[PDB]
Amino acid sequence: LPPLSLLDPAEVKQKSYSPESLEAMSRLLEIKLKEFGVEVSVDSVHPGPVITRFEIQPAAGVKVSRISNLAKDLARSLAVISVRVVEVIPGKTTVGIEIPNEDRQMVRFSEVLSSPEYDEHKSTVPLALGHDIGGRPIITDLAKMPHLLVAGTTGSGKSVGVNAMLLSILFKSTPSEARLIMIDPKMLELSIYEGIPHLLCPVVTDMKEAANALRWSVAEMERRYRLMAAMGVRNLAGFNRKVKDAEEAGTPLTDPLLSTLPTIVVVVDEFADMMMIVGKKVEELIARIAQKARAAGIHLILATQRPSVDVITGLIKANIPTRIAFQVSSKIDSRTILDQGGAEQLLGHGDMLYLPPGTGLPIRVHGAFVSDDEVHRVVEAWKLRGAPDYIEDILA
Amino acid sequence: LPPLSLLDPAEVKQKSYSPESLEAMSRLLEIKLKEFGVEVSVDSVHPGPVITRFEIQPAAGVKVSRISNLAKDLARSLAVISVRVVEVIPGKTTVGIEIPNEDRQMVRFSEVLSSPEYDEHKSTVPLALGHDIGGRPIITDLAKMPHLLVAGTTGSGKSVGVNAMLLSILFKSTPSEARLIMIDPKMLELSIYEGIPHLLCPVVTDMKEAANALRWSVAEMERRYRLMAAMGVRNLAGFNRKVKDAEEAGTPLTDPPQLSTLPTIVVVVDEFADMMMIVGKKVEELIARIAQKARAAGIHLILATQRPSVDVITGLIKANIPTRIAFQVSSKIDSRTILDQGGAEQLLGHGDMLYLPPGTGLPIRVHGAFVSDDEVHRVVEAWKLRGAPDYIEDIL
Ligand SMILES: Nc1ncnc2c1ncn2[C@@H]1O[C@H](COP(=O)(O)OP(=O)(O)O)[C@@H](O)[C@H]1O
Ligand SMILES: Nc1ncnc2c1ncn2[C@@H]1O[C@H](COP(=O)(O)OP(=O)(O)O)[C@@H](O)[C@H]1O
């Protein structure tokens, strides 16, 4: 297995911004808000890698919308590009205002994978995304999402995000226990994984070839539910426990009407292009994959460039609860993906909002930068250990 | 019939919500509303297991929209997550403001079934929802509803409420008295119920099989209307009363092959958004033609979703189904979708619903009684040790 020390080293960071600078910026924010109608008092300061949260306590009689509806001018008067107003902090009584820095301390991916969370993560398909607003890494299980929407306009750090997710897959699991399927309509980025041993098909450039791939995925989900009903265990983890215990206790169980089945991960670079070229049947197949495949071990990474009702329909939203929103156009597309506002106030360059599975406030996550050096190194490191193991029934 | 003591006991309550803390919270509410435009004195305090109703008397000439248009800010300036404003209390001049407590008391299901109303309940299909905002247990007959909708986003406590309803069916009804048909398009929850004699069909996964099960329900409703028109008796319970009176006096009846006592079919459908996603509008017309006529035939529905959209809950569903359960939804739009009025977005999750009674009703706020998976396994095992399964080939 390729060790995590293949990645690029850490950086002599631009650490220790002085408390006199923090006090000057806090008094500057108090004065610039006092110049408008509102009155404020900076309570605490939380300096972070990319932005800097100013937990402010508004004065008596000041609503939150009187802080929300002037964020353009609050960002303009502070000589920054865009400021973000967290309207509620869970637990305290303070409105959160998050201001970008001058020198962006860039998040590095080896600093994310060296966490206590990732190296002790029991699952076989984790996702390292990056640090949060305070510098702590966020690694959440992709087998618990159990699907993923990714959107944001161009140049907002999205192909790097999908590559960070795929490297988060590739640093932990052997091809026996996890296994990828790559659909790449714009054959520019995901052709870099050409011939890795964690695949099933050639990296799909065509479109009807991708339709055959999705029909194979539906058939695989159906035969795995029939096989788990034959064995008599609900989900994939208990089935792998049963096929472990059969191989331990003397005699394995033969193939019923066996091995450790892999956790299939079906990624899509741009499903906007798929529902451009192929049509409604791709929408129906993605709907009936994401309807049922949580217990079967088949997952989706849907990425797109158009957070619109044309691309993201209601059927896609119904089965996929977990969203990733990078910098988008405006509040219309933010309410199209996250079903709420806030995604327009980002910075790009991999500055996402991680909506957790379920209902909650979105956690702002700065996406870890990855480079072609590391990606080519990991691809060649897996091509040394394994071979192309294609089963071409997926595309027939 | 299974005894009531099969469940987990009620935990030690966290009582002594002290009157000094209630008085301090009342004065803090008066001051935090006095900081805004309004002026209001707290009249009385009603404590509860989850929230706490503060009946407040507004001053002369201050409206109620000037209380309900700043619920976000009042909940921010009281260190809570969300406040709920009852705009009208029946029979008094006060306005209900309901603040969540500091320590959530989990609602114990054995406390709910130990109510005097449930044990002295007449109808063979009751539902035990939970306690209301004061601690009074809410127990609702199903055959007077005569249908049910359940909404609420992911992670809001929908499946635990559905399991509580199905155990409320289980703890009173012998299988000749009531009988279930379950449909679950996922294997998420309702696979555990497979084995009990209260099923007719095994737990339906195939949605074409689900549509044919609903067509069987249409056909069974039609043959029950034909049999009741032959017997001359209007509803199903009247028919059971007539056949019980005839079999009491030693006079056996005949079918125009001896007549028996018909059961009360309760067709639960776990997530019908996926059902109409896969099958289509045929399902919607089947649900309409069931829910029109099924009140006198004994067929009842527990529909549930995780998407209160206009594509799913159309007018065709809301025409015949007047009883609505609304858990935590995202915004005002989905609240006005299912409850046909606002208010459902101001809830707390963790199974905290708004029971809309059938007809003219200000919606009752009911806390969902919690049931763990251990009790559900225990009741399924207690039925599988008690009675034998009885299925029907004809339904498919
Ligand atoms: N965390 C980051 N730090 C620095 N640069 C980044 C980061 N994330 C992305 N970028 C840069 O932003 C560029 C545009 O992102 P990309 O996903 O290629 O846009 P698109 O979504 O149009 O494909 C990338 O080429 C990458 O170099
Ligand atoms: N009455 C309750 N009291 C406390 N917690 C509850 C209650 N009902 C549900 N929950 C919590 O909600 C979760 C169940 O939510 P669920 O109905 O599965 O939502 P979904 O079906 O959308 O996933 C459980 O993990 C449980 O902890």
PDB file of N, CA and C in Angstrom, chain B residues 6 10 62 106 113 123 132 258 281 292 299 306:
ATOM      1  N   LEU B   6     -43.545  -5.530  28.357  1.00  0.00           N
ATOM      2  CA  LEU B   6     -42.460  -5.987  27.505  1.00  0.00           C
ATOM      3  C   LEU B   6     -41.480  -4.868  27.167  1.00  0.00           C
ATOM      4  N   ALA B  10     -39.740   3.567  32.061  1.00  0.00           N
ATOM      5  CA  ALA B  10     -39.545   5.008  32.027  1.00  0.00           C
ATOM      6  C   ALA B  10     -38.317   5.375  32.846  1.00  0.00           C
ATOM      7  N   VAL B  62     -50.562  46.718  20.561  1.00  0.00           N
ATOM      8  CA  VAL B  62     -49.440  46.057  19.907  1.00  0.00           C
ATOM      9  C   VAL B  62     -49.945  44.768  19.269  1.00  0.00           C
ATOM     10  N   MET B 106     -36.411  12.928  27.176  1.00  0.00           N
ATOM     11  CA  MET B 106     -36.864  11.977  26.173  1.00  0.00           C
ATOM     12  C   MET B 106     -38.215  11.401  26.580  1.00  0.00           C
ATOM     13  N   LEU B 113     -48.055   4.320  26.738  1.00  0.00           N
ATOM     14  CA  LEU B 113     -49.032   3.237  26.748  1.00  0.00           C
ATOM     15  C   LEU B 113     -49.655   2.999  28.115  1.00  0.00           C
ATOM     16  N   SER B 123     -61.633   1.593  20.012  1.00  0.00           N
ATOM     17  CA  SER B 123     -61.366   1.183  18.641  1.00  0.00           C
ATOM     18  C   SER B 123     -60.131   0.299  18.548  1.00  0.00           C
ATOM     19  N   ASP B 132     -48.255  15.937  24.779  1.00  0.00           N
ATOM     20  CA  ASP B 132     -48.365  17.276  24.224  1.00  0.00           C
ATOM     21  C   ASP B 132     -47.396  18.192  24.971  1.00  0.00           C
ATOM     22  N   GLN B 258     -69.104 -19.698   5.197  1.00  0.00           N
ATOM     23  CA  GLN B 258     -69.708 -19.001   6.321  1.00  0.00           C
ATOM     24  C   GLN B 258     -68.982 -17.685   6.565  1.00  0.00           C
ATOM     25  N   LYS B 281     -47.760   8.367 -12.130  1.00  0.00           N
ATOM     26  CA  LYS B 281     -49.050   8.918 -11.727  1.00  0.00           C
ATOM     27  C   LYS B 281     -50.127   7.845 -11.569  1.00  0.00           C
ATOM     28  N   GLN B 292     -60.543   8.046  -1.382  1.00  0.00           N
ATOM     29  CA  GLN B 292     -61.916   8.515  -1.515  1.00  0.00           C
ATOM     30  C   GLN B 292     -62.883   7.662  -0.700  1.00  0.00           C
ATOM     31  N   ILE B 299     -60.202   0.012   5.081  1.00  0.00           N
ATOM     32  CA  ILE B 299     -58.857   0.289   4.594  1.00  0.00           C
ATOM     33  C   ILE B 299     -58.419   1.659   5.095  1.00  0.00           C
ATOM     34  N   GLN B 306     -40.237  12.145   3.022  1.00  0.00           N
ATOM     35  CA  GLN B 306     -39.188  13.026   3.518  1.00  0.00           C
ATOM     36  C   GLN B 306     -39.030  14.222   2.594  1.00  0.00           C
TER      37      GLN B 306
END
